[PDB]
Amino acid sequence: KVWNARNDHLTINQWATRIDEILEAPDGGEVIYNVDENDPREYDAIFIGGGAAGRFGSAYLRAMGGRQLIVDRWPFLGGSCPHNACVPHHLFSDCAAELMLARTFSGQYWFPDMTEKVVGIKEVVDLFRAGRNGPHGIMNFQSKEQLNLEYILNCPAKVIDNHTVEAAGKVFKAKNLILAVGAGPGTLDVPGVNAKGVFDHATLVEELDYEPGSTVVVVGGSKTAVEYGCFFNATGRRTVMLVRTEPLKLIKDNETRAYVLDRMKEQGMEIISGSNVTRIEEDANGRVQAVVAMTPNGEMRIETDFVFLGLGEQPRSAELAKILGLDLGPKGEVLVNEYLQTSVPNVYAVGDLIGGPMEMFKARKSGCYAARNVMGEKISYTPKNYPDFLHTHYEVSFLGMGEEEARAAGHEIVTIKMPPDTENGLNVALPASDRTMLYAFGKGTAHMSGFQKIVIDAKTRKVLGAHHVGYGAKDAFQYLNVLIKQGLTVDELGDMDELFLNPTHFIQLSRLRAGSKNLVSL
Amino acid sequence: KVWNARNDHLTINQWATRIDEILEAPDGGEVIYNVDENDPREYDAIFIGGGAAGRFGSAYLRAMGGRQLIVDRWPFLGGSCPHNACVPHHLFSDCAAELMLARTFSGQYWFPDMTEKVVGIKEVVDLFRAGRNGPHGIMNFQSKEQLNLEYILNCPAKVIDNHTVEAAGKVFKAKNLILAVGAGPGTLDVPGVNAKGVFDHATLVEELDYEPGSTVVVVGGSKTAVEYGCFFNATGRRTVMLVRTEPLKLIKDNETRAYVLDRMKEQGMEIISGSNVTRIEEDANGRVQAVVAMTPNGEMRIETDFVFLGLGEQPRSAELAKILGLDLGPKGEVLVNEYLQTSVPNVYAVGDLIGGPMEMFKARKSGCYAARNVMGEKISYTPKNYPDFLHTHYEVSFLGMGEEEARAAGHEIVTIKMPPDTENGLNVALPASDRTMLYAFGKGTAHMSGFQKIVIDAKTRKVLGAHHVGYGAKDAFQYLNVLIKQGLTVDELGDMDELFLNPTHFIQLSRLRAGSKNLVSL
Ligand SMILES: Cc1cc2nc3c(=O)[nH]c(=O)nc-3n(C[C@H](O)[C@H](O)[C@H](O)COP(=O)(O)OP(=O)(O)OC[C@H]3O[C@@H](n4cnc5c(N)ncnc54)[C@H](O)[C@@H]3O)c2cc1C
Ligand SMILES: Cc1cc2nc3c(=O)[nH]c(=O)nc-3n(C[C@H](O)[C@H](O)[C@H](O)COP(=O)(O)OP(=O)(O)OC[C@H]3O[C@@H](n4cnc5c(N)ncnc54)[C@H](O)[C@@H]3O)c2cc1C
Ligand SMILES: NC(=O)c1ccc[n+]([C@@H]2O[C@H](COP(=O)([O-])OP(=O)(O)OC[C@H]3O[C@@H](n4cnc5c(N)ncnc54)[C@H](OP(=O)(O)O)[C@@H]3O)[C@@H](O)[C@H]2O)c1
Ligand SMILES: NC(=O)c1ccc[n+]([C@@H]2O[C@H](COP(=O)([O-])OP(=O)(O)OC[C@H]3O[C@@H](n4cnc5c(N)ncnc54)[C@H](OP(=O)(O)O)[C@@H]3O)[C@@H](O)[C@H]2O)c1
Ligand SMILES: CC(=O)CSCCS(=O)(=O)O
Ligand SMILES: O=S(=O)(O)CCS
Ligand SMILES: [Mg+2]
Ligand SMILES: [Mg+2]
């Protein structure tokens, strides 16, 4: 059953409704076929997958006057991001942050008494499931009506060879393939891993048909594990994170990492380093009842009926590699050169399929650079020196070098931080700005008002790294990183116009010290 | 009593406690005397006032190796900002944003029932009052111990001539004066303005000895009026704004201003344009009971026991201009040239005393620039092309040109915005990021998820303006403005590394259009 959608013009909200209908149809729903049957030009590229990489790649290719076709097995464009990855992740992190605020000020002002309050995880997941077609609807609309994309959705692609793809029972030819099928959730090789009650980011939002009990176990120690783990904890649940090595190694600044981990522990999270699950115990109903794990302090058993795996994502390379003869790396990533070209002539690979860093900027940018190459513009892509962030119950942003890292690299350094390093320590009403004001003024809560630091070369006066725990700095790090890569000094930073009270206090604190030829930390 | 504090070394929290004693001393308290009795250099500059401009001016002058003294009539440094201006404003705005969220999701998830809920205005002001000695503490601490400054606090300065000041029973000498006494709240010349129950930002935090009733009248239609008015409204009080002309003229982009005003009215704010208060009515106890105003539709009377004036701030120029004979401008601002020099030899003026823009960047920078000029380094300062922000129940950030502005100005332009212009209008799940996810996903709340736009020159491809309503962009606008001043194009914007999901979607939305030589709006 093929719906010829070319000459239909659904609104965003009609698209949202229609996608929902197709997703819910017992038979699997109709194919969405949006192809210009009157255009005689050959396809410059067929994209296998229309997630962040395939969709942006197609948008750019089309903007350059080339012809593209997306094939995606989902009835929407945008891939994992709206459906089960960054979007739900951010809804859950918004909840985690507000819940920490509510629990900190329990029984003060407008805040409800949270003492005995357990928030339903399923309730919030269901809110996500009920609203996720909004972003789906915009993706289908924007792609067709504003970006002029051709696509076939709700259809697994069947790659024939490096120039030939079957979709919707039609065979299409192209000058190139861009492979954009992303990566699937990592798993554990232990008894019980397939028990009901074991989830990952993908299955959480498809299969949670009960409300978890009082204890949650999270496996993993980076972004996904810590993001979902803080949300679970914020709902009122005892949360134990089993971390194979050490948690949050992405936070290179030791003081920043410590603040973040300390705040997580204050919220009641238990974070266990050097630990590996050995078994997930099932009850006689087939649901998880406990997790057994080896740690540096011997075997532990944690009773729980809800386990969340936040391991890495595994590139979806197997089928395509068999068909096309693609060279793969150790973790199954499709090997590419710096023009995104695979070992196979005229076949590019992009997004999570080509491995880490698995981020939206990497996905969209690799998509567009492959598209430029297909359109005859020789352009390399090597992601390097990018800013980064993750959520706990706070926003955590970082770029460049940690303070220790900068010294080990041979730099003489000063730092500018908040709060100052004093006898009263964190227990002072700084740093403060939007969404930290209550922490800053509340009785005994001032230590929660945030932490931040820039790392500066004492000789060149260049800013070598920036680090922030709080709210409202993440967006700023995108732009600040560009200024830093251009060579930003403490002097130039001090010379900017601040917008006080500012999530980053870097500008004015830089100004307080830049009047000196010999720089001193603040 | 004059306390020689020079060799005492209070912590931040010790300072906090002790400014308290002094402020709540029945007699006015001792003078805080922090002067270096060894230094034989003559003062390069005495600063009259130790607020933002005075304090930062001193920091920089001292950093450059010069000698400074601050005289301030408060027992703390930092000026209006920590005591009654930006800091309490940000606390009230945090409450306003959090309260809109709670009222929107009342009786859902963790959110309690807000239906009959009136939050205490006095309670929140008392919270501010109870904690502001935190910030005062950091201020005196960091100024003495970290920034190596000399100061005399809790003592009004008596300026004798352009080289002489009396303070703490003593007479001081200096090569220059830097006049930095700020501005005081504007008022009305109507009967009843001196009634009990009429406040401005300064008196609200000193004299609020009751809980306001159910209607609040705000007078004014710019930053202060809208910031405090949204907070009053967020507490659950009927809030009527009486606006001489039109509200929020600072928001130049028409659609951006409309979104902001639309969301204010949706929260239940009443904004009456073209209106002037004619009488504040008093009850038999001399308390406000109503406001009478002339409007375009004739006289109106609003019953109320709490009036908030959010008018201009007026430069404190009178006394100083009499003692020194300074030239003033038409609002009483001390006139200065590009080096911050007044009409009087060796006397400079900075901060709010020199007029608009009355912002922290301006006060601190004008402060530092006058210090550099005092120190022989000839540097000119004319604030222009700065970013700006205000709070409603949202953060509202803006720089450069609005859309209509740019076309009227003879720029051929394209716009990249979110949500798109479609028949579903604002009722779609974008824009979305931290602190707008619940709006994005909730039933009937999607129009609340925000609004944003960049304005782009179609031929140079340069970004001419940027506009954002939501949360978490304010800090970015600091850094984004600098890039725009350096010549930022849509292609350079698109080439950056976004941190998805980002408060500003500008990077990726630019990337969607940047592949075409002829740009098309999104
Ligand atoms: C929980 C989680 C949270 C994250 N949070 C963030 C974040 O906050 N910020 C950030 O930058 N990144 C985040 N990421 C990473 C981000 O989601 C990915 O890097 C990105 O989505 C990768 O895009 P992609 O196009 O490569 O793959 P995908 O989004 O996975 O798209 C692949 C597409 O290929 C299609 N497909 C697969 N096989 C076939 C086939 N046989 N036939 C047809 N179609 C097929 C799929 O239907 C899918 O639509 C997060 C990831 C996860 C897992
Ligand atoms: C309600 C409100 C909210 C605001 N919010 C923001 C914001 O969010 N962001 C922003 O950038 N700006 C904001 N502003 C503007 C900002 O407060 C001012 O631009 C800034 O405080 C001006 O600094 P200043 O040093 O010039 O004056 P002030 O901070 O007022 O300092 C003046 C000092 O002079 C002293 N003084 C006066 N007379 C004497 C005397 N004769 N002897 C000794 N000392 C004397 C006073 O004690 C005072 O300490 C806000 C203003 C208001 C009113
Ligand atoms: N921007 C965001 O907020 C966000 C949110 C979610 C995901 N993401 C992105 O999505 C990508 C996913 O891949 P990744 O680079 O995160 O993978 P990764 O770094 O290899 O691993 C992620 C975590 O899984 C753990 N892990 C992997 N295999 C394990 C195993 N067999 N047993 C126990 N633990 C195991 C790792 O622990 P050790 O390192 O301790 O071995 C690590 O903590 C990341 O790049 C991430 O940045 C981003
Ligand atoms: N960064 C921030 O978020 C922030 C927050 C608060 C304050 N501030 C600063 O504090 C300064 C205060 O000065 P301002 O610029 O607000 O002064 P302004 O522009 O002269 O006036 C501010 C508002 O008061 C109104 N007003 C003035 N006199 C009035 C009168 N007699 N009757 C009725 N209304 C009157 C004006 O109305 P009309 O225009 O309708 O005549 C305007 O709405 C500002 O410059 C601002 O920079 C900054
Ligand atoms: C609506 C939305 O942005 C969903 S997540 C991003 C998908 S895409 O724009 O990267 O294809
Ligand atoms: O600008 S100052 O640091 O003096 C005051 C900030 S509240
Ligand atoms: Mg603090
Ligand atoms: Mg919306």
Coordinates of C-alpha atoms in Angstrom, one line a residue, chain A residues 11-14 55-56 59-60 62-65 81-82 86-91 93-99 101-102 108-112 114 117 119-120 123-124 127-135 138-139 141-142 146-148 359-362 364-365 368-369 372 381 384-389 391 393 395 397 418 420-425 427-430 433-438 440-443 471-483 485-486 488 491 493-509 511-517 521-522, chain B residues 11-14 55-56 59-60 62-65 81-82 86-91 93-99 101-102 108-112 114 117 119 123-124 127-135 138-139 141-142 146-148 360-362 364-365 368-369 372 379 381 384-389 391 393 395 397 418 420-425 427-430 433-438 440-443 471-483 485-486 488 491 493-509 511-517 520-522:
Chain A
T11 CA 0.1 21.1 7.5
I12 CA 2.5 20.5 10.4
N13 CA -0.4 19.3 12.6
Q14 CA -2.0 17.2 9.9
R55 CA 17.9 14.8 6.4
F56 CA 20.5 17.7 6.7
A59 CA 18.7 19.6 2.6
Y60 CA 22.1 20.9 1.7
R62 CA 19.0 20.1 -2.6
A63 CA 20.0 23.7 -1.7
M64 CA 23.1 23.3 -4.0
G65 CA 20.7 22.4 -6.9
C81 CA 16.5 12.4 17.8
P82 CA 12.7 13.2 17.9
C86 CA 17.8 13.9 22.2
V87 CA 14.2 15.1 22.4
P88 CA 12.9 12.8 25.2
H89 CA 16.3 13.1 26.8
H90 CA 15.7 16.9 27.1
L91 CA 12.1 16.5 28.3
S93 CA 16.3 16.5 32.0
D94 CA 13.9 19.5 32.3
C95 CA 11.9 17.3 34.7
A96 CA 15.0 16.4 36.7
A97 CA 16.1 20.1 37.1
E98 CA 12.6 21.3 38.2
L99 CA 12.2 18.3 40.5
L101 CA 14.2 22.7 42.7
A102 CA 10.9 21.5 44.0
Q108 CA 8.4 26.7 51.0
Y109 CA 6.4 29.4 48.9
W110 CA 4.4 27.8 46.1
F111 CA 6.4 24.5 46.3
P112 CA 4.4 21.4 47.2
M114 CA 7.8 16.6 48.2
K117 CA 6.5 12.2 46.7
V119 CA 6.7 10.9 40.5
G120 CA 5.6 8.4 38.0
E123 CA 3.5 9.2 33.5
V124 CA 6.3 11.3 32.1
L127 CA 3.7 12.5 28.1
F128 CA 6.6 12.2 25.7
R129 CA 4.8 9.4 23.7
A130 CA 1.7 11.6 23.5
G131 CA 3.6 14.7 22.2
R132 CA 6.4 13.3 20.0
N133 CA 4.4 13.5 16.8
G134 CA 4.6 17.4 17.0
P135 CA 8.3 17.4 16.2
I138 CA 7.3 19.6 11.6
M139 CA 10.1 17.4 10.2
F141 CA 6.4 19.4 6.7
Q142 CA 9.6 21.4 6.7
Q146 CA 10.3 24.3 2.7
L147 CA 13.4 22.2 1.9
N148 CA 12.0 20.6 -1.3
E359 CA 26.4 14.0 18.4
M360 CA 23.8 16.0 16.4
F361 CA 26.5 18.5 15.1
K362 CA 28.6 15.5 13.8
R364 CA 24.2 17.0 10.4
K365 CA 27.6 18.3 9.5
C368 CA 26.2 18.1 4.6
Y369 CA 29.9 17.6 3.9
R372 CA 29.0 18.8 -0.9
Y381 CA 35.4 16.8 7.6
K384 CA 37.9 18.4 16.5
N385 CA 37.8 21.0 19.3
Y386 CA 34.1 21.1 19.7
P387 CA 32.3 22.3 22.8
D388 CA 30.3 19.7 24.7
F389 CA 27.6 19.3 27.4
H391 CA 22.8 17.0 31.9
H393 CA 20.1 17.8 37.5
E395 CA 23.4 21.7 32.8
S397 CA 29.1 22.7 29.7
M418 CA 33.1 31.3 40.8
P420 CA 36.1 32.1 45.0
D421 CA 38.3 29.6 46.8
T422 CA 37.8 30.6 50.4
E423 CA 37.1 29.3 53.9
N424 CA 33.3 29.7 53.2
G425 CA 33.9 27.5 50.1
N427 CA 28.5 28.4 50.8
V428 CA 28.3 31.8 49.2
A429 CA 25.7 33.5 47.0
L430 CA 27.7 33.2 43.8
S433 CA 21.8 34.2 37.5
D434 CA 18.6 32.8 35.9
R435 CA 17.3 29.6 37.6
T436 CA 20.0 29.7 40.3
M437 CA 18.7 32.7 42.2
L438 CA 16.6 30.6 44.7
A440 CA 21.7 31.6 45.9
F441 CA 19.3 33.1 48.4
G442 CA 17.8 30.0 50.1
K443 CA 18.6 28.8 53.6
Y471 CA 21.8 26.7 33.7
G472 CA 21.7 28.9 30.6
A473 CA 25.4 28.7 29.5
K474 CA 25.1 25.7 27.1
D475 CA 24.0 27.9 24.1
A476 CA 26.7 30.4 24.9
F477 CA 29.4 27.7 24.7
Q478 CA 28.5 27.2 21.0
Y479 CA 29.5 30.8 20.2
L480 CA 32.2 31.1 22.8
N481 CA 34.0 28.1 21.4
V482 CA 34.3 29.9 18.0
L483 CA 35.8 33.0 19.7
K485 CA 39.3 28.9 18.3
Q486 CA 39.9 32.3 16.8
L488 CA 40.4 34.8 22.5
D491 CA 41.6 41.1 27.6
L493 CA 36.9 38.6 26.8
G494 CA 36.9 41.4 29.4
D495 CA 36.2 43.9 26.6
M496 CA 32.8 42.4 25.7
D497 CA 29.4 43.7 26.7
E498 CA 28.0 41.5 29.4
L499 CA 24.3 40.9 30.1
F500 CA 24.2 40.8 33.9
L501 CA 23.2 38.7 35.7
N502 CA 24.9 36.3 33.4
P503 CA 25.1 32.5 33.5
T504 CA 28.8 32.8 32.6
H505 CA 30.5 35.6 34.7
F506 CA 33.6 35.3 32.5
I507 CA 33.3 38.7 30.8
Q508 CA 33.3 41.0 33.8
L509 CA 35.6 38.7 35.9
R511 CA 37.8 42.6 33.1
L512 CA 38.6 42.7 36.9
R513 CA 42.0 41.0 36.2
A514 CA 43.0 42.1 32.7
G515 CA 44.2 45.5 33.8
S516 CA 47.4 43.7 35.1
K517 CA 50.4 42.8 33.0
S521 CA 43.6 34.1 39.5
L522 CA 40.2 35.2 41.0
Chain B
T11 CA 35.6 36.1 55.4
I12 CA 32.7 36.6 53.0
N13 CA 30.2 35.3 55.7
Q14 CA 31.8 37.4 58.5
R55 CA 34.0 49.5 42.2
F56 CA 35.1 48.3 38.7
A59 CA 39.6 47.4 40.3
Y60 CA 41.1 48.3 37.0
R62 CA 44.5 49.4 40.9
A63 CA 45.3 46.5 38.5
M64 CA 47.2 49.1 36.4
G65 CA 49.2 49.9 39.5
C81 CA 22.8 46.1 41.9
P82 CA 23.1 43.8 44.9
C86 CA 19.6 43.7 39.2
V87 CA 20.0 41.1 41.9
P88 CA 16.5 41.3 43.5
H89 CA 15.0 41.7 39.9
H90 CA 16.6 38.4 38.9
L91 CA 15.2 36.6 42.0
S93 CA 12.1 37.0 37.5
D94 CA 13.1 33.4 38.5
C95 CA 9.9 33.2 40.6
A96 CA 7.9 34.6 37.7
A97 CA 9.1 32.0 35.2
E98 CA 8.8 29.1 37.7
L99 CA 5.3 30.3 38.7
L101 CA 5.3 26.9 34.7
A102 CA 3.5 25.8 37.9
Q108 CA -0.4 17.7 36.9
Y109 CA 2.6 15.5 37.7
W110 CA 4.5 16.9 40.7
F111 CA 2.8 20.3 40.3
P112 CA 0.4 21.2 43.1
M114 CA -2.3 26.7 41.9
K117 CA -2.9 30.1 45.3
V119 CA 2.1 33.6 46.7
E123 CA 7.5 36.6 51.6
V124 CA 9.7 36.8 48.5
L127 CA 13.7 36.2 51.2
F128 CA 15.7 38.8 49.3
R129 CA 16.1 41.0 52.4
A130 CA 17.3 38.0 54.4
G131 CA 19.9 37.0 51.9
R132 CA 21.2 40.2 50.2
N133 CA 24.0 40.5 52.8
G134 CA 25.4 37.4 51.1
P135 CA 26.1 39.3 47.9
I138 CA 31.3 38.8 48.6
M139 CA 31.5 42.5 47.5
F141 CA 35.5 40.7 50.6
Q142 CA 36.6 40.5 47.0
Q146 CA 41.2 40.0 46.2
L147 CA 41.2 43.3 44.3
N148 CA 43.5 45.2 46.8
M360 CA 25.8 47.0 34.1
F361 CA 28.2 46.7 31.1
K362 CA 28.0 50.5 30.7
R364 CA 31.5 48.9 34.7
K365 CA 33.1 49.7 31.3
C368 CA 37.2 51.1 33.7
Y369 CA 37.7 53.4 30.8
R372 CA 42.5 54.0 32.2
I379 CA 40.8 55.4 25.3
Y381 CA 34.2 54.8 24.9
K384 CA 26.9 51.2 20.6
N385 CA 25.7 47.9 19.0
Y386 CA 25.4 46.0 22.3
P387 CA 23.0 43.2 23.0
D388 CA 20.1 43.7 25.4
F389 CA 17.6 41.7 27.4
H391 CA 12.4 39.5 31.6
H393 CA 7.8 35.5 32.4
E395 CA 13.8 35.8 29.0
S397 CA 17.1 38.7 24.2
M418 CA 11.0 29.3 14.6
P420 CA 7.6 28.8 10.8
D421 CA 4.9 31.0 9.2
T422 CA 2.1 28.4 8.5
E423 CA -1.6 28.2 9.2
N424 CA -0.8 26.3 12.5
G425 CA 1.1 29.5 13.7
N427 CA 0.7 25.9 17.9
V428 CA 3.6 23.5 17.0
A429 CA 6.3 21.9 19.2
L430 CA 9.2 24.2 18.2
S433 CA 15.1 23.3 24.4
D434 CA 15.9 23.5 28.2
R435 CA 13.0 24.9 30.2
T436 CA 10.6 25.0 27.2
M437 CA 10.2 21.1 26.9
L438 CA 7.1 20.9 29.1
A440 CA 6.6 21.9 23.7
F441 CA 4.9 18.6 24.8
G442 CA 2.0 19.7 27.0
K443 CA -1.7 19.7 25.9
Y471 CA 15.2 30.7 28.2
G472 CA 18.9 30.1 28.1
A473 CA 19.9 32.4 25.2
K474 CA 20.7 35.5 27.2
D475 CA 24.3 34.4 27.9
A476 CA 24.9 33.4 24.3
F477 CA 23.8 36.8 23.0
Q478 CA 26.9 38.2 24.7
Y479 CA 29.2 36.1 22.6
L480 CA 27.0 36.0 19.5
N481 CA 27.0 39.8 19.3
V482 CA 30.8 39.9 19.2
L483 CA 30.8 37.5 16.2
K485 CA 30.3 42.7 15.1
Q486 CA 33.2 40.8 13.5
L488 CA 29.2 36.8 10.9
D491 CA 27.5 30.3 6.2
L493 CA 26.8 30.4 11.5
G494 CA 25.9 27.2 9.8
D495 CA 29.5 26.0 10.0
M496 CA 29.6 26.1 13.8
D497 CA 29.1 23.1 16.2
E498 CA 25.7 23.3 17.8
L499 CA 25.0 21.8 21.2
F500 CA 21.5 20.3 20.4
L501 CA 18.9 20.8 21.8
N502 CA 19.9 24.4 21.7
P503 CA 18.1 27.5 23.1
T504 CA 19.1 29.3 19.8
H505 CA 18.5 27.0 16.8
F506 CA 20.3 29.6 14.6
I507 CA 23.3 27.4 13.8
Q508 CA 21.5 24.4 12.3
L509 CA 18.7 26.5 10.7
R511 CA 23.0 25.3 7.8
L512 CA 19.6 24.3 6.1
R513 CA 19.6 27.5 3.9
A514 CA 23.4 28.2 3.5
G515 CA 23.9 25.8 0.6
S516 CA 22.1 28.1 -1.9
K517 CA 23.8 31.1 -3.5
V520 CA 15.5 31.8 1.0
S521 CA 13.7 32.5 4.3
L522 CA 12.9 29.5 6.6

